[PDB]
Amino acid sequence: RLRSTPQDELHDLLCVGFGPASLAIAIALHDALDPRLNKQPKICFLERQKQFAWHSGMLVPGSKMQISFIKDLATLRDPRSSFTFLNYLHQKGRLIHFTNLSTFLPARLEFEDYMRWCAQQFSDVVAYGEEVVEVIPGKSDPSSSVVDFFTVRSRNVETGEISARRTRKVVIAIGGTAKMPSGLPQDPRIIHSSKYCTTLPALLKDKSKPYNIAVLGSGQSAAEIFHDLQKRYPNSRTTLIMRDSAMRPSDDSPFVNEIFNPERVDKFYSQSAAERQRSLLADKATNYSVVRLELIEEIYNDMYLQRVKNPDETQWQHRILPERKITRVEHHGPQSRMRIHLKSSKPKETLEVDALMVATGYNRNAHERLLSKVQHLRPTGQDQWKPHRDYRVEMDPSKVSSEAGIWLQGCNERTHGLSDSLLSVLAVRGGEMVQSIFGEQLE
Amino acid sequence: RLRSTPQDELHDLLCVGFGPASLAIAIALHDALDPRLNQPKICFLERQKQFAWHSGMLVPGSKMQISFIKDLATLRDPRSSFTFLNYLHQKGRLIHFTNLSTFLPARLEFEDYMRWCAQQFSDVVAYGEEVVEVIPGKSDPSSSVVDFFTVRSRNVETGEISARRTRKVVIAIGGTAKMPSGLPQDPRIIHSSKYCTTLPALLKDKSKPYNIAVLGSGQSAAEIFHDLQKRYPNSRTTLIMRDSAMRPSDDSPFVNEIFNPERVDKFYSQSAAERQRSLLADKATNYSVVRLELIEEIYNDMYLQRVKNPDETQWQHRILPERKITRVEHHGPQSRMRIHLKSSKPKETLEVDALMVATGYNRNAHERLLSKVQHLRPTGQDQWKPHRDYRVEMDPSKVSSEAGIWLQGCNERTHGLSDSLLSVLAVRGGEMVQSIFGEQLER
Amino acid sequence: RLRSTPQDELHDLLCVGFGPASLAIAIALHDALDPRLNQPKICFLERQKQFAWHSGMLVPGSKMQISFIKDLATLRDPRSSFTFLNYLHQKGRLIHFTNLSTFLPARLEFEDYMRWCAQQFSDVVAYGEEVVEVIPGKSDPSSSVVDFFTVRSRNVETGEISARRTRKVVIAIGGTAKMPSGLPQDPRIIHSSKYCTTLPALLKDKSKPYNIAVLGSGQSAAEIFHDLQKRYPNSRTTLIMRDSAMRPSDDSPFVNEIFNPERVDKFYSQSAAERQRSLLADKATNYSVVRLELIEEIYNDMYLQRVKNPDETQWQHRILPERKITRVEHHGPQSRMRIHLKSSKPKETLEVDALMVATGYNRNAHERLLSKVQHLRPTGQDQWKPHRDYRVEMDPSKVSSEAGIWLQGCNERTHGLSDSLLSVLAVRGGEMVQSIFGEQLE
Amino acid sequence: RLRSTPQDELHDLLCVGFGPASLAIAIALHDALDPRLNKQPKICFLERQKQFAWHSGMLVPGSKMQISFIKDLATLRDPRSSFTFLNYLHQKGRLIHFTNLSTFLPARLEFEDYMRWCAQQFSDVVAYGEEVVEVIPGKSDPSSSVVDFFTVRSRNVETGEISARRTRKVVIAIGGTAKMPSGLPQDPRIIHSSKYCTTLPALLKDKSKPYNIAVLGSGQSAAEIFHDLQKRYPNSRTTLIMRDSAMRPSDDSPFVNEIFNPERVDKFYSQSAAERQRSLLADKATNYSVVRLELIEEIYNDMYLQRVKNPDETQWQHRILPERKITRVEHHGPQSRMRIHLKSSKPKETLEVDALMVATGYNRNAHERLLSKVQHLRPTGQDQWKPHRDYRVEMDPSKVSSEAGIWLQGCNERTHGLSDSLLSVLAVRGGEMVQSIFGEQLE
Ligand SMILES: Cc1cc2nc3c(=O)[nH]c(=O)nc-3n(C[C@H](O)[C@H](O)[C@H](O)COP(=O)(O)OP(=O)(O)OC[C@H]3O[C@@H](n4cnc5c(N)ncnc54)[C@H](O)[C@@H]3O)c2cc1C
Ligand SMILES: Cc1cc2nc3c(=O)[nH]c(=O)nc-3n(C[C@H](O)[C@H](O)[C@H](O)COP(=O)(O)OP(=O)(O)OC[C@H]3O[C@@H](n4cnc5c(N)ncnc54)[C@H](O)[C@@H]3O)c2cc1C
Ligand SMILES: Cc1cc2nc3c(=O)[nH]c(=O)nc-3n(C[C@H](O)[C@H](O)[C@H](O)COP(=O)(O)OP(=O)(O)OC[C@H]3O[C@@H](n4cnc5c(N)ncnc54)[C@H](O)[C@@H]3O)c2cc1C
Ligand SMILES: Cc1cc2nc3c(=O)[nH]c(=O)nc-3n(C[C@H](O)[C@H](O)[C@H](O)COP(=O)(O)OP(=O)(O)OC[C@H]3O[C@@H](n4cnc5c(N)ncnc54)[C@H](O)[C@@H]3O)c2cc1C
Ligand SMILES: NC(=O)c1ccc[n+]([C@@H]2O[C@H](COP(=O)([O-])OP(=O)(O)OC[C@H]3O[C@@H](n4cnc5c(N)ncnc54)[C@H](OP(=O)(O)O)[C@@H]3O)[C@@H](O)[C@H]2O)c1
Ligand SMILES: [Ca+2]
Ligand SMILES: [Ca+2]
Ligand SMILES: [Ca+2]
Ligand SMILES: [Ca+2]
Q1: How many whole angstroms separate alpha carbon A196 and alpha carbon A225?
Q2: Quick one: which residues bind FAD (chain C)?
């Protein structure tokens, strides 16, 4: 229903990224325009992938959502929305079938399809294959001392051509970038977890071959990869390398998990920086460096069966090496394998591996580089973009028109809480964003 | 949305009973008239003084036995405003229920949801009306053809009789208590359906060492037996069952596809012999079975008695399996009742202060209620025959086409094990609205 | 420590079979001989070359269906050296098993536990011996009374016949494959009991798109159906069942009291009518049922196919309910058989490279084995009748009291649903040692 | 089979305390003397309580063990022992019935009965009702300057009379003592969790009275008390006061829990003090200030039901006050209720309560007072007892004979790991203790 804006027109809103966060904004805008639900803006979305896809590099077989399907992209804002997960199922003729599953945790493949089904209804306003590379200040009058729009430049991921689009307002919703240990070198055989399903098969084409494959880390991504490798490459020898002493379980308990409630964002944001830092630390185990207990137990059971076959752990096909860090990687010459050097992680062993899967998490700072050509518009003394409660970043008012602005989505954990980077509050936050950006225009 | 019809007018439809089945029809009619989602003269008569859902069995901790997705609207249209999720959103409780991580709300909570739905229809529901007669009406003195029905109800407070005229009747009156034959009439012999409303009046002192027997081994018997040991901590309770053990309900996913709304067509279109065979083979999904978790809790309570005393005969709370009651003897209120037991195979004497009889329900009450119109059935029929759309066969030479009677909730034999449950109410509500109002709504 | 008896001597007891039932007797005799806890001339004959527990069905990930406490000793004496926990302690694995927090070891692990037990009786077990007949013996040329038995066994690898003489015999030979009568004999039609041992030799290319059918809907059919989809990832598998659905086994605690060892006394004393009715009423504990967790796993795999394609007819792996096989075309050089299906209610065909037949077992094989002594039964018996202590009725005028035959594992009709399982083996082994050797040990 | 030594004789070993730690030693000595298990020392145990009892003040209805029954007092050392939990069940005629329970976690009540069954076989070497008060040095030749025995002085609970027993070797196995926040005054209405079942009923006799009852803390003891009070006093208003933001789940994941393995004691002890501290910190959530998830979920569901009835948390019968600390208690005067003053626990609110349950944990320092009169025998420069791997404390060899010594049990978490104070390694540690104390004597 949302109609396209011509590429060279002045947009009202341009969103960088079309993952769940921008999709929830698109959905919330649709719903706010729906006479059936409420009491058209010139909008477009740029997405570097060639079609909608949700962490496709980590769609390992059997992987599940880590959040109740009720926390979809609409329901917590309005269960009557056409964009609920249950309505998607009903449109697919699968609602009763999903009901008989008796699970709150769909396969990630299914929840990706739900979001693909939503995203297809916005295809007229999404430009796929466009990687935004810079955002530059615009002036309607060149002799004005005030920026009143932004030019967003994007690179065609197939041809390299640079496109430009003008917009009053920008949303940056680009998720995370791979965090690599600084000491690891670049090599086609060292692959971050985010590119597991998508590039490792190309590297290791023979599923029956006895590859040596190592996994670095001990959070959910590492555990899913380590566990999947033993099925994907049944004759491989896999090694899980972690600096902790053990995989530790994610905190799914209900009182702790109320920090993810949508209505907590007001209170979290109003707290002092010192309190927000302490709170995030105390609740870290709900999300970071932890594994769903059910997957830990599965891996533990697999280890036990190896113990039944051979009591000597050093002889096991699949091994966990706890409290170790990689200190050196040899990787030159035509030989297939790298030599990983391991030391204790407390305050030498070597391994010959065909590939090293690096499951060491994500950073959420890439908006600083994307926004570098407008960062002179920030107030003096800021080395970082500062979002208000409504996610609009602070601009020097002598330099930027009140009609122009930039909002950040998904990189605001420090100011808005641990739910900021997840699916947890997207339905409600998308509704807040539509009111913040479009509210006056709608009325 | 549904406006009252003056009590004197010729109604389009009168529904007898305002339990979940009739409520689902009201909701389906509301949704069919809702321009977001897509007036007849309708009224409902309910004997209870307000909406209430097996209030006599609202024992503490009792839970739904069916996923909340099978509420009164979602399987027909997840966008409906009458979904359980939207009810939670309207109550400010949606996020809190999400953190519960359960498909099975407390029965108390699901009653409040349906009561919240029911309040939307307060203009078209007359509470405290017990329907006692359905009378054939002939608007033409010069024709013996019946073209409407007069429904007579007795007000439970005044006892006055009121009459309403309607073209069509829905009979949606649930079940009546099934009692073993030959029990004496004694206020201390109480059917499970009146457990919460009658037993506390009879046994007022919660600390007294009452002897309380429970007859049966299905879900009602297990919930009552388990609850009595908490409600009367010093009581001596006895579960009497003719089976050798409580058996677990079948909640496995392939078997339970028989409850899918789209299976109604398939079940109906089978011969009487195959329908009868089907119901028998699948009986363990519903009848004479207990949810495994409750079985396990009762078993653990029994085990703890064994820890304290190895002699089962001296336990406070006991199960007497493979027993039948030969008679319940009484000598007035001055003394306990005496339950005489023998083997249920093709002996004990119990002295009790009350006998909870959890022996299930019959769904044949519509036969008495419709006795004054049964001469309009085709020659030879001794029971009402519903077609697929739930309308009973009438002799077409005796009843007009504008007049009809439908049955809801008593049609297991022709429509499947889901008929008496919540399982297909949302979808069946939609079909009923089509069958009864479809043309009227098309014009 | 059970010492061997010279083969030509007259044994006190000869046991046919060395599966868990006979093994539980050996363990109970060992424990009865141990003054720490509290020698007859005994020998066991086993057709397999070593101890093995349904090796043809040791599917990856398959689990015990009974708590490890019902091992081969604990319910009779938790102090026994032959408990599962002591075995783990001896293996250095007890703390590691504890951390699993499960009552259900892998079948592979429980087999190893019983193998560890069985290796301690190697002095009294002859493997590779298939018993073929039991013939009566009369040690007195002047009396017509049978007072011993000769057990004749064919060596598996040499085919040579050996004769062993014994006063008492135990038959503990488990079950035989039950096949639907209308199926023909073909290398591509394999009973579930030979899944792991026979199917790989027939279907050698783990990556080829075979069509593989599975007949039945009990635990065996479910385990094979689910496993085939991993073992042959490109196969098209089909579960053919005459019921409408896989149904869950009853593991609920009151019902499962029927497996309690002390229940055998009460069950045995019931009438034949009551025992038959009782067995029927409790059938869902054991027969034609699937553990709920596995049903749900199979259901979830079906659901994921529906996510990828809503048309069930085009799914890789399918279930075909309320079907019966009316005909199999298997003659010809074509690698695939054609299966003809009809409704099982009182024209579709499948072309398959193999049909796995998971249709259960019979436990009547002792009738053929004992045929040369069946004239010793009392008149008017067409079956062997076990007493409570598992000794079969013999005509007193024909058989001396110091001679007898006991049956193990085939007495469900008289001793209850626990008879064929591991459930009462520890306790039953103790009772058997008392019945067979009790007067001898006192 | 262990026979009494006359009270006035020189014992080989005297154990202070007869809880699970001392009982495990008694069991290991018995097994070491059994020719079945391995092909008599003068020993006595002194126990303050009148019979064996295992945290009887916290035997709340429904409380369960938090460790697999396989970790009983013998099995991990020798599954053949007559003192295993499975053998105890067999002796009681309950083994099959417990098997049908399908649980690794007996009721605490049942596990206490198991240990009482073990303890009663040592009744000839245990003096109950004896509170040890001091350990004093002994010189068999008083003119010499070498200590070669110890006199253990104990107060008879019934008569207060002091008796003295002499021994070469002493074991201190006295568990923990109630830890109270230093700011709380002494008052009969302020009760530590350790005395909940035994003292609170004496204080609040009428189970139907609407008492106000507060609970301080958020570990397992606070959760069990908070949950139990709501059943024990159905009309009470209970309040859980915690300085954390929420109850947090205990870590029962299997890799982490390998720290409780008996064979890990060697690994843990052989680490530096820095690394022992760091590791105890990393694994703290297995044991301290945490609650079993299933209990958290049950309390959460009870709170949810209150919310169904009334969305305003301030009106709930039972409430949780997070991030609070008690700053003042008013408790002088004849009024039934104390006034508790609360403030935020972050770096005006009052409650009036009939009682305050203090679930603030335990200290394990009480051995230092009992050994004060021998702490001059430590080597020069120690102000704390230093146990070696085999749990014997370091003595100055020029002052203490090699045939005399003191061992500590249960208070050595610092040096021996998180399992030290639990049942986790008692079977194995008992065997080790028998070898250390009586090894040469038996060989
Ligand atoms: C493997 C994995 C599984 C997860 N599972 C869950 C879960 O089950 N439940 C849950 O609540 N959360 C989960 N998360 C957390 C995750 O962050 C959210 O699920 C969600 O993806 C966040 O949405 P988003 O739109 O903020 O970020 P993303 O999903 O990362 O989306 C960002 C988008 O922007 C695009 N983009 C990036 N840079 C540019 C650019 N320069 N120009 C144009 N486009 C660009 C990317 O291609 C991407 O599509 C998971 C995270 C990972 C890594
Ligand atoms: C204790 C109990 C618990 C159950 N729990 C579940 C569950 O968790 N999930 C599930 O799917 N099903 C459950 N059921 C099955 C139950 O039948 C349905 O939940 C549902 O109540 C059926 O709805 P109904 O409108 O058909 O009948 P009812 O709910 O019985 O309602 C019929 C109505 O008609 C009224 N009535 C009867 N006679 C007259 C008259 N002469 N005049 C006027 N009014 C009359 C009654 O007062 C009542 O309000 C349960 C049944 C029982 C007994
Ligand atoms: C696939 C499968 C899985 C099962 N899993 C379980 C479980 O987890 N828990 C449970 O309680 N029960 C289980 N059962 C039931 C099973 O019957 C028992 O576990 C157990 O195997 C019975 O032991 P048995 O010794 O009486 O028979 P078996 O285990 O069958 O042993 C019989 C032995 O006799 C031998 N034999 C046969 N004929 C001769 C002959 N003529 N001469 C010499 N030797 C002969 C056989 O080789 C065999 O070794 C399972 C059954 C099957 C088929
Ligand atoms: C409420 C609670 C529940 C617990 N549940 C578990 C569990 O389920 N699993 C687990 O692994 N651990 C559990 N623990 C940990 C607990 O420490 C162990 O269960 C166990 O109690 C340790 O035994 P111990 O003998 O070292 O100390 P205790 O059990 O404390 O025994 C110490 C004994 O010494 C006696 N004593 C003390 N001082 C003197 C004196 N001066 N003179 C004479 N006698 C004295 C006491 O009377 C007492 O009997 C629990 C602890 C608590 C508080
Ligand atoms: N199925 C799903 O829904 C799914 C799947 C995957 C991930 N996720 C979610 O995505 C988010 C990220 O999870 P993640 O596992 O990818 O990342 P993560 O939680 O941040 O874990 C990163 C792991 O790598 C380690 N690590 C980080 N830097 C390291 C370094 N320089 N050297 C050595 N080790 C290092 C970390 O150890 P330290 O803690 O010591 O730094 C940790 O073990 C989580 O919220 C997760 O739940 C969800
Ligand atoms: Ca949860
Ligand atoms: Ca289910
Ligand atoms: Ca069970
Ligand atoms: Ca665990």
Answers
A1: 8
A2: 46-54, 65, 131, 420-422
The residue written with tokens 């964003």 in the block is A433
Name A357's bridge partners. Answer: A191, A215
Domain span holding position D239: 1-443
Task: Give dist(CA C189, CA C199) in Å, integer.
Answer: 9
* Nearest ligand (C-alpha, residue C300): 7
Between the alpha carbon of residue B353 and those of residues B211, B233, B324, B335, B350, the distances in Å are 5, 15, 19, 8, 10
Distance CA D186, CA D428 (A): 41
Q: Is C265 on the interface with D (CB under 8 A)?
A: no
Q: For C86, which residue in chain D has the nearest alpha carbon? A: D79
Residues 6 or more apart whose CB falls under 8 angstroms from that of D369 comprise none
Is the sign of the CA dihedral D260, D262, D263, D269 positive or negative?
A: positive
Q: Is C36 on the interface with D (CB under 8 A)?
A: yes
Contact D43, D75 (CB under 8 A): no
Q: State which approach was used to obtain the coordinates.
A: X-ray
B182 C-beta neighbours (distance < 10 Å), count? 9
A304 to chain C: which residues are within 8 Å by CB? 96-97, 100
Question: In whole angstroms, how far apart are CA D211 and each of D206, D318, D359, D406?
Answer: 9, 12, 19, 48
C25 CB neighbour count, 10 Å cutoff: 30
Ligand 2 within 6 A of CB of B436: no
Strand intervals (E) in B7-53: 10-16, 42-45
Check CB contact under 8 Å for A311 and C93. Answer: yes
Quick one: CA dihedral B214, B215, B216, B217, positive or negative?
positive
**Using an 8 Å Cβ cutoff, are A150 and A137 in contact?**
yes
Q: What is the DSSP letter of B364?
A: -
Q: Which of B66, B69, B423 to mutate to test the interface with A (most CBs of A within 10 A)?
A: B69
The alpha carbon torsion through C240, C241, C242, C246 (nearest 10 deg) reads -160
Could you give the number of structural domains in chain A?
Answer: 1
| Contact yes or no for B410/B382 (Cβ under 8 A) | no
Q: How far apart are CA C40 and CA C25, in angstroms?
A: 13
In angstroms, this model's resolution equals 2.0
Reduced to 3 states, what is the DSSP secondary structure of residue C342? strand
As given in the structure block, the two tokens for residue D306 are 């209150």
Phi, psi of D427 (to 5 degrees): -55, -45
Which residue out of B217, B239, B251, B254 would a mutagenesis test of the C interface target, given it has the greatest number of C Cβ atoms within 10 Å? B254
C220 is in an annotated binding site: yes
Check whether C242 is labelled as a binding-site residue: yes
CB contact under 8 A, A253 and D275: no
Q: What are phi and psi of A21, to 5 degrees?
A: -65, -50
Helix, strand or coil, per DSSP, at residue B431: helix
**Residue C325 in tokens:** 């096989």
Contact C355, C191 (CB under 8 A): no
CA of D101 to nearest chain B CA: how many angstroms apart?
A: 7
- Residues with CB under 6 Å of ligand 1 are A 16-22, 46-49, 54-55, 58, 65-67, 131-132, 173-176, 221, 370, 410, 421-424
Assigned token pair, D119: 């303890």
Distance CA B312, CA B378 (A): 59
Residues C427/C259, Cβ–Cβ less than 8 Å = no
Give the total residue count for chain D.
443
**What's the 3-state SS for A28-81?**
HHHHHCCCCCCCCCCEEEEECCCCCCCCHHHCCCCCECCCCHHHCCCCCCCCCC
Closest by Cα among B357, B412, B428, B387 to B175: B412
| Secondary structure of residue A264 in the 3-state scheme | helix
CB pairs under 8 A between A and D: 64
Write out chain D residues lying below 8 Å of B306, CB-based: 94, 97
